[PDB]
């Protein structure tokens, strides 16, 4: 019933500015803090921008400060990313994502279905391994290790993704070992700190995917590079 569209995407000349919209219902839009999200050619996940529930504080990575722009507007039920001064860099698929509140840590809980864009102490998350090839009925194991502790008062920030091609990424497990409702119990994650690990077993069929680590401990939000599952 929650849904978030996306539109505004395309081609762009280096220098030039765009401006990403994304429409949302099924939910109480001035409730939430949103987020973009882009995914890189290299399949890299890296944030963009949030905005709070009303709009008072803006977030940026170095990266894009001072060149984009995040906005609400509660009465329309709309977000939006205004770019400018665009780069080869910013070449990416650019997602929308809602801050889910159901649980204390930050997680995002759902995503558009994404716009493209073509151009023409932080806290790093190493992922291991990158790539993952495992047989039908055995056991997948992703590692994260954070370069400083994700804890904070008690909880540990780390939430776990997975991503099927043309699709957004889906949260799996949230806080480090909490399942997402609705995601099967073969699921499961682990550690506390800065070693964390995500468990799959069995593995089925409809589990090859990448998969992704994620803090929310600290801006700017940051990704593991990725785990490509291949199954048989």
């Known amino acids: 019933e929650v849904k978030l569209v996306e539109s505004g995407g395309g081609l762009v000349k280096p220098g030039g500015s765009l401006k990403l919209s994304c429409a949302a219902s099924?939910?109480?839009?001035?409730?939430?803090?949103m987020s973009w999200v882009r995914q890189t050619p290299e399949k890299r996940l890296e944030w963009v921008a949030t905005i709070s529930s009303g709009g008072s504080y803006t977030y940026y990575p170095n990266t894009v400060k001072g060149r984009f722009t995040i906005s609400r507007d509660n009465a329309k039920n709309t977000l939006y990313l205004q770019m400018s001064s665009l780069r080869s860099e910013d070449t990416a698929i650019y997602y929308c994502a809602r801050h889910g509140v159901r649980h204390r840590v930050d997680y995002f809980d759902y995503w558009g279905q994404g716009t493209t864009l073509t151009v023409s102490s932080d806290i790093v998350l190493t992922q291991s391994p990158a790539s993952l090839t495992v047989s039908l009925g055995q056991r997948a194991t992703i590692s994260c290790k954070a370069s400083q502790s994700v804890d904070y008062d008690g909880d540990s920030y780390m939430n776990w993704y997975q991503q099927k091609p043309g699709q957004p990424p889906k949260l799996l497990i949230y806080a480090a070992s909490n399942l997402e409702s609705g995601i099967p119990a073969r699921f499961s994650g682990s550690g506390s700190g800065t070693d964390f690990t995500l468990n799959i077993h069995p593995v089925e069929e409809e589990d090859a995917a990448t998969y992704y680590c994620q803090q929310s401990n600290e801006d700017p939000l940051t990704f593991g590079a990725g785990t490509k599952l291949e199954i048989k």
């Open positions: 099924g939910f109480t839009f001035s409730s939430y803090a």
